């Protein structure tokens with residue numbers, strides 16, 4: 146019975162092991178967060194929720210609507226929605242010329258982009274956090290209407306040669322189901338879930354509330370005191386002081402962005418999809434396992450990646466153009482939308498976001514051409530800390546100092 | 550081109566996805582620890598390492614050896630090692646009766662267990678942290694010598710009917726290579742690595758030093774102030790106060806035990822195995838992914854599990870006994886060794902460790918019969934926080950209060 150029991154192996158944590166199953170770490174983080182903050186979350190939940198008076202605020206908005214510009218914009222987006230729908234319904238039956246339809250759709254999209262920006266920059270009575278919601282609603286509406294017109298154009302061009310054909314997909318039910326759906330690519334037959342899971346909805350709502358409380362606590366107890374150490378704007382300040390102050394904020398800002406990602410792309414979108422019985426719930430991929438910046442940029446946001454691939458990248462390639470030109474176009478569009486979403490709601494136009502997005506390129510080349518394995522993943526995790534979140538934190542800090 | 554792109558799926562974080570690859574979380578923890586504590590680690594490393602004078606302490610021990618009982622015990626363990634080796638070498642050639650050899654081996658093992666305990670309980674000049682090292686060395690020596698005599702007995706009984714046979718494996722080189730090897734199961738041919746990786750050794754030493762500094766910082770900045778809030782012993786204290794105080798210490802104690810596991814079972818053992826070119830490096834398995842307490846107890850420590858299975862469990866089953874009796878025997882041996890390793894170095898004999906190990910049973914039954922999936926893993930992670938680490942923390946706290 147002298148037989149052997151040892152054999153060449155390697156410990157699980159070592160990179161040469163090829164081990165990947167680490168769900169226990171996630172469950173540990175959840176258990177630690179709950180054990181540490183459950184009493185405070187319950188206290189704050191009772192305190193705030195005992196003041197829940199939605200009828201009060203609804204009536205208040207109903208007494209004077211012209212004093213709340215952000216919900217008025219979120220409501221007026223439906224005018225552009227109905228305009229695009231009417232253009233499409235006339236294009237199907239009505240013999241409206243395709244060039245006229247294209248021109249009207251381009252006008253509708255340009256107005257969708259330009260109207261909220263004008264109303265925000267001109268009306269000084271709108272808060273810089275409802276302005277962001279209005280601008281996000283209008284950006285999402287712009288992308289969704291682009292996809293809508295594109296898919297309907299494809300189906301129309303096809304028609305010249307349990308399931309729904311082309312002309313019977315133009316209804317307000319389908320259009321509005323698409324407008325509220327957690328996706329930016331239009332289809333005629335969406336995949337559906339069998340039923341609404343109430344425990345799933347409850348857990349998602351609890352996650353949303355808990356991470357909201359956690360983010361407010363993080364901000365008000367870690368970043369506001371650190372900012373109030375020396376309240377000066379980042380503009381008109383030596384680079385040494387800028388870096389010295391950003392070193393104290395890089396970590397809590399990173400945690401805030403992580404909580405943003407989780408409670409926005411996992412819990413909120415799954416709650417919406419569960420309420421709507423939406424089938425496809427692939428809203429993200431393993432960006433945390435990225436070994437280069439390009440993998441992270443592709444896999445951190447799947448809706449926008451699908452949109453860029455299906456309506457912006459591949460149509461541009463099919464018309465004849467090098468991949469470099471299409472990548473440059475995507476880069477410029479992303480920079481423009483970063484500006485649209487950051488500078489406009491704050492009315493603060495600096496060169497920080499642009500140079501951040503620019504310096505993101507040689508960093509990507511370096512991480513791709515020098516690091517590999519777990520060191521590439523560490524370099525990506527480090528680039529997330531001193532990358533674009535810093536360029537947004539500078540804006541938010543300068544605004545909080547200049548305006549309070 | 551109206552074809553579809555959506556399909557029924559589920560987000561990666563949801564338990565219904567079946568996703569497991571989460572190495573990015575580990576790399577994130579490492580990057581965060583480094584970014585947060587690198588300056589302090591470098592400062593403390595410079596400060597302490599500029600005092601490195603090993604020749605000084607070696608000479609000091611050489612001037613008066615009778616004043617340092619712990620290294621004298623760690624040195625005197627070699628006497629028992631050589632005694633067992635001589636018994637075996639005489640059993641091979643020398644016609645020593647097998648019953649006499651068995652009796653001498655039993656006497657040697659009983660002395661291995663009883664001598665350090667007596668020297669510790671009788672000599673009051675030994676520190677309660679060198680006492681633990683001596684007791685651990687003698688426990689490990691006891692287990693290793695048990696395995697040695699068992700394997701040699703198997704090979705001898707077989708003999709009555711690149712590679713090494715039985716009689717040519719009895720040498721001081723092989724015995725001492727086994728004694729320093731990170732394993733408790735003896736073999737005649739160990740698997741070997743091809744070469745010593747210097748970068749691997751450097752990273753393991755750096756991990757050891759870094760986690761040592763981190764643990765000292767955790768203790769001296771989180772648990773010593775919390776203890777000094779009201780310095781009273783856990784004995785002669787109301788249960789309400791006991792639980793109220795343990796609630797403030799459950800978390801840092803858990804983090805301390807996690808760092809213990811990592812820097813002891815991964816970095817230290819891999820450094821030793823790399824210095825010795827040891828092949829098998831499976832020192833642990835995915836205990837963090839456990840869905841019941843039994844899986845965790847089996848997979849958290851692979852050396853002791855292999856020992857219990859190969860020399861204690863299976864030999865007991867082959868002689869005829871129900872599985873319940875063997876499990877009870879393992880439980881009693883583990884309780885005895887917990888006492889031997891905790892109570893003796895502190896000279897403090899209470900009923901806390903025994904009732905902790907006892908209450909571990911109905912907790913295991915409950916977690917097995919009620920929870921499943923990620924909830925079982927959460928229950929196991931919660932049982933690790935209020936389980937045995939608490940029963941060791943009570944001992945250490947009472948000692949630190951009573952003695953300083």
Ligand SMILES: CCCCCCCC/C=C\CCCCCCCC(=O)SCCNC(=O)CCNC(=O)[C@H](O)C(C)(C)COP(=O)(O)OP(=O)(O)OC[C@H]1O[C@@H](n2cnc3c(N)ncnc32)[C@H](O)[C@@H]1OP(=O)(O)O
Pocket residue numbers: 402403405406409439442443445446449450453454458468471472475479480482483486529533534
């Ligand atoms: C917005 C809300 C945010 C909430 C909080 C989120 C937290 C996230 C969590 C944690 C990180 C912290 C936050 C870090 C980041 C913060 C950034 C902001 O917040 S800015 C704010 C404003 N928003 C933007 O400015 C848009 C940002 N970008 C995006 O949303 C997308 O990720 C985007 C637009 C970048 C996706 O675009 P693509 O990179 O997928 O596009 P293509 O270039 O077409 O990629 C396809 C790739 O495949 C290759 N390819 C080649 N042949 C192909 C083929 N046949 N088919 C497909 N691909 C092909 C192509 O060459 C390309 O790869 P090749 O770049 O060259 O390496």
Ligand SMILES: CCCCCCCC/C=C\CCCCCCCC(=O)SCCNC(=O)CCNC(=O)[C@H](O)C(C)(C)COP(=O)(O)OP(=O)(O)OC[C@H]1O[C@@H](n2cnc3c(N)ncnc32)[C@H](O)[C@@H]1OP(=O)(O)O
Pocket residue numbers: 806807809810813843846847849850853854857858862872875876879883884886887890933937938
């Ligand atoms: C020591 C240094 C620690 C440093 C820090 C570590 C940190 C760790 C990290 C994080 C957690 C925090 C710390 C929590 C824990 C702290 C506890 C202490 O520190 S106490 C201190 C003193 N030491 C002890 O008292 C020993 C503790 N125990 C151990 O070391 C082992 O894990 C031990 C002895 C429990 C392993 O024994 P088995 O459970 O493997 O033994 P069997 O019962 O034979 O298991 C085999 C199983 O397979 C089944 N089986 C059935 N047929 C089989 C067959 N044919 N072959 C094999 N198995 C079979 C058997 O029925 C059994 O499973 P069925 O229990 O019934 O569910």
